[PDB]
């Protein structure tokens, strides 16, 4: 089938001048030996497959990227809507998964999960219809709303979702909307030609903004809503793999880190998880 | 209209489904894709690449390069053990952070043979012979060469070619093992001993070092995608 792992051909005893157990890693060449070259083996028909380790199967799983909150009633208009500059560096799990590769190119499937609640205080609603939320995506350059009740929410060309509670989470598909021929997870360079300004990948990040608000005016009480954004990469292509990260993440715009140990300690070089008394192995 | 009927699983969001969805940007003109070298199609292309294994990961050595060096000395070393560790590619302080263990940590089930390449980084006039043994489970770990010769062993003679490969085969009662290893899916022990000893001429340094690399064979497989227990955060990064 596709793509079944290799079989172990039967091998017997031998006494030859062609030794494949000895190699030279100084050439940057990983040895392509198999168990049959160092011992006698049997013929097994291996039906195992590598279908679940492919890139399209490794990355096509929705993961949270942002959690935002916004109020519905009033007070400090900045609190009546939420905004987000699109990243993949705010949640560590998908960030590391993406950072396994230097370059990526994929279509996206975006899901929005909005959960509301009732805020405490005096003058509660005691009865209210369902809440309708609006999510509007502004490409780089367009006007950005300054309040829940603002003219910028018409979205004559900006795509938007009007979503009512009690339904399935909102969802769409987005093509490969980058400027270059692939998404650059890393960038060893600057923004200006004089080598100053912004260093790292932050300069190439020009994706846009997402704003979310309550369509309802309410006016009898306060209700707080939380929006969670989920990203599913499909049709994924990846180039130039990298080692996985060791240090915990610190910033969402840098690769800054603190020096961490390579692994976890163990008692001795001959430690095999036993009590290990003293003599000829432990002194 | 057409009479339908809604079944369980309606209006749910399962994070591992395959459904179509409308495009927010109709008729978008995607920029052409070019040829970029080094394309990955499968993660096992990465686990099949040699990576240096920190066998000497004691308390002091984890914070230096000394974790990667296995020391060898040229006296009467017939009763000393060069190194020894459990065979646990996913859950073991020696293997869990290498280019192989990192890949296995995003999966719960693994199965296959594993290559361990040992490289002698001594002088060109230093010669020796070592015994690299693998012992399947069911008995206590070997305590000496006389006990460790009874397993799958290779006798490595250091000479003009510097690297020797020990291939840990697949011997288990189950098709797959668990990355989070237990007492029921144990995989044995890997040990090293002096066959004859390290001998140097007058002038060469008397102590040498060995480096260890680990990769996967062409019959290694992983399944059951999970989260890795290596990265975590307290609050949203800003």
């Amino acid at each position, epitope marked *: 089938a596709v793509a079944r792992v290799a079989d172990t051909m039967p091998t017997g005893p031998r006494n030859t001048e062609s030794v494949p157990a000895l190699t030279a890693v100084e050439t940057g060449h990983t040895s392509q030996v198999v168990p049959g070259d160092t011992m006698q083996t049997r013929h097994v028909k291996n039906y195992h497959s590598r279908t679940e380790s492919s890139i399209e199967n490794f990355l096509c799983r929705a993961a949270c990227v942002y959690i935002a909150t916004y109020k519905s009633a009033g007070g400090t208009p900045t609190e009546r809507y939420a905004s987000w500059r699109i990243n993949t560096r705010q949640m560590v799990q998908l960030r590391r998964k993406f950072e396994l590769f230097t370059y990526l190119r994929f279509d996206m499937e975006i899901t929005f999960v909005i959960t509301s609640t009732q805020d405490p205080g005096t003058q509660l609603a005691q009865d209210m219809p369902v809440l309708t939320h609006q999510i509007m995506y502004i490409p780089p350059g367009g006007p950005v709303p300054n309040s829940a009740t603002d003219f910028a929410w018409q979205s004559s060309t900006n795509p938007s979702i009007f979503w009512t509670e009690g339904c399935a989470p909102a969802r769409m598909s987005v093509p490969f909307i980058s400027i270059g021929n692939a998404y650059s997870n890393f960038y060893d360079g600057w923004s200006h030609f004089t080598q100053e300004g912004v260093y790292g990948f932050n300069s190439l990040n020009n994706m846009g903004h997402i704003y979310v608000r309550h369509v309802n005016e309410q006016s009898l009480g306060v209700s707080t809503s939380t929006l969670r954004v989920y990203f599913k990469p499909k049709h994924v292509r990846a180039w130039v793999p990298r080692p996985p990260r060791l240090s915990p993440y610190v910033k969402s715009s840098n690769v800054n880190f603190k020096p961490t140990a390579v692994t976890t300690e163990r008692k001795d070089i001959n430690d095999v998880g*036993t*009590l290990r008394p*003293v*003599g000829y192995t432990n*002194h | 209209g057409l009479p339908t009927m809604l079944t369980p699983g309606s209006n749910q969001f399962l994070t591992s489904d395959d459904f179509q969805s409308p495009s927010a940007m109709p008729q978008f003109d995607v920029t052409p894709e070019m040829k970029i070298p080094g394309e990955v199609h499968n993660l096992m292309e990465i686990a099949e690449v040699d990576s240096v294994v920190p066998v000497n990961n004691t308390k002091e050595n984890i914070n230096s390069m000394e974790a990667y060096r296995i020391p060898v000395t040229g006296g*009467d070393q017939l009763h000393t053990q060069v190194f020894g560790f459990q065979m646990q590619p996913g859950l073991n302080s020696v293997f869990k952070r290498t280019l192989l263990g990192e890949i296995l940590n995003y999966y719960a089930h693994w199965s296959g043979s594993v290559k361990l390449t040992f490289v002698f980084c001594g002088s060109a006039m230093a010669t020796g012979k070592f015994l690299l043994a693998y012992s399947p489970p069911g008995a206590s*770990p070997p*305590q000496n060469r006389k006990q460790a010769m009874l397993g799958t062993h290779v006798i490595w003679d250091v000479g003009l070619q510097s690297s020797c490969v020990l291939c840990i085969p697949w011997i288990s009662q189950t098709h797959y093992r668990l990355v989070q290893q237990d007492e029921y899916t144990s995989a044995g022990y890997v040990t090293c001993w002096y066959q004859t000893g390290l001998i140097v001429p007058p002038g060469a340094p008397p102590s040498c070092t060995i480096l260890c690399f680990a990769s996967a064979c062409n019959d290694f497989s992983v399944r059951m995608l999970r989260d890795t227990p290596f990265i975590e955060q307290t609050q949203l990064l800003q």
Partner: antibody
Amino acid sequence: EVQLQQSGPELARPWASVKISCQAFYTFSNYGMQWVKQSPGQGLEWIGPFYPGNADTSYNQKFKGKATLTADKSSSTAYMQFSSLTSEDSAVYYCARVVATTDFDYWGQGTTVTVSS
Amino acid sequence: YIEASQSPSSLAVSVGEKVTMSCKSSQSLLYSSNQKNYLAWFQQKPGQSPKLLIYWASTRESGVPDRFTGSGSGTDFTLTISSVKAEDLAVYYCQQYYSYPYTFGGGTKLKIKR
């Protein structure tokens, strides 16, 4: 045969850390030897091993920093380095040797210290 | 610091009878690989150096009479004597050599009751 002749009396004032010494009648490769502190007011305790044929040395946690060991291959004699000699350090220090991986095959006579000033 | 303590402090058993000393540890001293119990029994009289009597907690040092017999395993060890002599007044120590640091037993005196 393998009698471990120790040093003579070393009674002195405190802060005069004495190097207690022992001799041996066996080859100094692939064996070990230890010093154990004996005072009838403290029972028995242990200080640290020196392991010829392996070139390594440990110490008791209560005596960490307090004591140090070293030996000479071509001298057939091993002595102790001591630090911050006190009045309570009065004990009949011994010497013991290891023929096997462990256990004490032989014992020394026992040299006592009388820290008085 | 593993403690191989002893009980009781003394027995004052009379000459011509049996005696059974005991030694209890805080952690097992049996190596499941080579099947050995890491305990030794030592004899100490006031004035001279102590002498090893039993090694591996079940085998007797050469030059020692048959009166001493070691037994026990795991954590708990015993030393049985069938007929003691009045010259055996001493404090016997159950010394462990399993790990670091080496810790000797609490001893057991021999008083005068005849």
